[PDB]
Amino acid sequence: HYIGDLVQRTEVELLKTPNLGKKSLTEIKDVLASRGLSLGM
């Protein structure tokens, strides 16, 4: 629900989620990077 929940998940965990493609993972990284955040903090 929150950005703080998303930032704790690893890239390998997000790829296990249902309806989660490589394209949507790249979108999430690019958007988090635009805000100075990274996956796995």
Binding site: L15, K16, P18, N19, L20, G21, K22, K23, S24
Partner: protein
Amino acid sequence: LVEEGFSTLEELAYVPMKELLEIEGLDEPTVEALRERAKNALATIAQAQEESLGDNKPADDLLNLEGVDRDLAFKLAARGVCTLEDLAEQGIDDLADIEGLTDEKAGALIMAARNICWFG
């Protein structure tokens, strides 16, 4: 070719070279080229059908993901998911309408396909 009795691409591909060389105006280079084209046409036709349904191309590529039966591979290929890469690129939502595929089973197959394509 039809007047000389050839009706199929198989006849042209496999008939003895002597019978094709008896046709007026065929030389050995042209007969070899005609046979190579006939063999290439047959290969293309076979590959196309095997990718459209689940005969061989999708029965090996799309069916690489552990769990894919031949019926499911043909259902995937009917949606344009012909290869193990095409399946690795899908979401669960893109496969949700396939009769006999639960969201959990779709998720497991996509993850198996990704493990082979992206982490093998």
